[PDB]
Amino acid sequence: MLKQVEIFTDGSCLGNPGPGGYGAILRYRGREKTFSAGYTRTTNNRMELMAAIVALEALKEHCEVILSTDSQYVRQGITQWIHNWKKRGWKTADKKPVKNVDLWQRLDAALGQHQIKWEWVKGHAGHPENERCNELARAAAMNPTLEDTGYQVEV
């Protein structure tokens, strides 16, 4: 609904797992907001999901969103996986909980209430805002403050 919002997200992690962080830019109105935080022990896929979550949870009113991310992970979950996982109760064929279910659900919630146009960007070239999110992500990763509580070592 809300006029029009553009979101740019990225995530980056130094180990699997390792320190990681995210960067999200929100062009909410005729201005910009930036979100960026670094985690002590996490994964790159977790940081790519967290980036879209934080930005989307920042929106109060129902909006028409244009979210731009180069994340193959997010891309696959959104267009392939999610509808399928729900049908199966968020469990794989071996009945274990889907990996990063905590984040997938949190993202699924934040989705719900918006009209989103998803733009799947290829590379940093010609995508300045995405390159900047990467930079923020990398800086936060170097100065981690928070712990990633959903990070499952096993299951």
Domain locations along the chain: 1-155
Using an 8 Å Cβ cutoff, are 80 and 104 in contact?
Answer: no
Using an 8 Å Cβ cutoff, are 98 and 90 in contact?
Answer: yes
Using an 8 Å Cβ cutoff, are 78 and 65 in contact?
Answer: no
Burial label, 153 (beta-carbon count in 10 A; 0-12, 13-18, 19+): exposed
Using an 8 Å Cβ cutoff, are 25 and 151 in contact?
Answer: no
CATH 3.30.420.10 fits 1-155, yes or no: yes
d(CA 3, CA 90): 34
d(CA 1, CA 127): 26
Using an 8 Å Cβ cutoff, are 24 and 54 in contact?
Answer: yes
d(CA 83, CA 42): 26
**Could you tell me which residues are beta bridge partners of residue 115?**
64
- The H-assigned helical ranges of 1-155 are 44-57, 72-76, 82-87, 101-112, 128-142
Using an 8 Å Cβ cutoff, are 129 and 121 in contact?
Answer: no
d(CA 61, CA 63): 6
Q: What are phi and psi of 135, to 5 degrees?
A: -65, -45
Nearest to 133 by CA among 64, 54, 65, 58: 54
* Quoted resolution (Å): 1.9
